[PDB]
Amino acid sequence: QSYGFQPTYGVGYQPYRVVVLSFELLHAPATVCGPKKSTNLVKNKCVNFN
Amino acid sequence: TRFASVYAWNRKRISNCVADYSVLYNSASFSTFKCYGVSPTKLNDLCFT
Amino acid sequence: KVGGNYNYLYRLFRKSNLKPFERDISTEIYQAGSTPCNGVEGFNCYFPL
Amino acid sequence: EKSNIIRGWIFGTTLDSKTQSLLIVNNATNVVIKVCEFQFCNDPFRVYSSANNCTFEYVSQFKNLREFVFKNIDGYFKIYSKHTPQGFSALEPLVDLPIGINITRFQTLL
Numbered sequence A: 001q002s003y004g005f006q007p008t009y010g011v012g013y014q015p016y017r018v019v020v021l022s023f024e025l026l027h028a029p030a031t032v033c034g035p036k037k038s039t040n041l042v043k044n045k046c047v048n049f050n
Numbered sequence B: 001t002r003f004a005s006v007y008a009w010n011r012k013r014i015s016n017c018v019a020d021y022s023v024l025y026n027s028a029s030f031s032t033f034k035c036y037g038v039s040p041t042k043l044n045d046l047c048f049t
Numbered sequence C: 001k002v003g004g005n006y007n008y009l010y011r012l013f014r015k016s017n018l019k020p021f022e023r024d025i026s027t028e029i030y031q032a033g034s035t036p037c038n039g040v041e042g043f044n045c046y047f048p049l
Numbered sequence D: 001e002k003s004n005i006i007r008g009w010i011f012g013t014t015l016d017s018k019t020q021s022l023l024i025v026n027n028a029t030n031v032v033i034k035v036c037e038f039q040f041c042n043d044p045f046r047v048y049s050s051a052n053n054c055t056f057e058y059v060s061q062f063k064n065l066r067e068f069v070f071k072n073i074d075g076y077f078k079i080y081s082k083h084t085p086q087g088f089s090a091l092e093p094l095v096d097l098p099i100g101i102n103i104t105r106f107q108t109l110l
């Protein structure tokens, strides 16, 4: 059955968009990540590097 | 703005790319944030398939 | 049954990472304004009791 | 062979319905994950073929001995290559595909 959507309808019947994102568990090589850091570089000083 | 109907929803597979989660989390245009287990800091510190 | 009423209640939120044997008798809520994890007046800030 | 007769390879696990349909003439095309139905391959002078639910892609750039080594270990597919029998010469890596699927059979396109 078709929805009835009008600008004068109530908030309960107002149209709303829902996006559901589901990520699978770790069972395969990873392909989706995020940016880590962009820290600057220093020289001639005792530092801990990663 | 063009989304499919609820009975005929469109499934999009996203992989083999870097995901940016800060843009979604720093926007007030969204109201629902019901996420289970994950927190906005956590999911940026690991990777999935 | 009926006896328990606003008397037995635990804490759910973050921040307090108390060391062993510490009593955190506080009602801290971010009803003041922030930006990273929402937390302005209503979002990502509730009553953890 | 001093020619361009051979260009790509086909890999598969059960009945060549698995991944790795390659075409590496100059511009190496995607290591696709489609299943089967390649159909015509005599001397294309055309591209492409029938496809399926592809789930990966990739695009990159005496006589000569075109030599390769193909490995699949720990969910990683690895290729080593050289262009130029006695003598000694090491092989340097080219790519590293995280596809991580089983391969047990392979054929050649030519």
Ligand SMILES: *[C@@H]1O[C@H](CO)[C@@H](O)[C@H](O)[C@H]1NC(C)=O
Pocket (backbone or CB within 6 Å): D025, D026, D027
């Ligand atoms: C070079 O790349 C183009 C993509 O624009 C492709 O069409 C062409 O087939 C490639 N060259 C060879 C020899 O395959």
Ligand SMILES: *[C@@H]1O[C@H](CO)[C@@H](O)[C@H](O)[C@H]1NC(C)=O
Pocket (backbone or CB within 6 Å): D052, D053
């Ligand atoms: C691609 O693979 C999935 C998983 O096996 C399958 O459900 C789907 O039907 C396949 N797509 C096509 C077009 O066959």
Ligand SMILES: *[C@@H]1O[C@H](CO)[C@@H](O)[C@H](O)[C@H]1NC(C)=O
Pocket (backbone or CB within 6 Å): D100, D101, D102
């Ligand atoms: C490869 O085969 C093994 C055993 O035959 C199986 O456990 C594994 O899931 C297969 N790999 C893929 C990607 O299906």
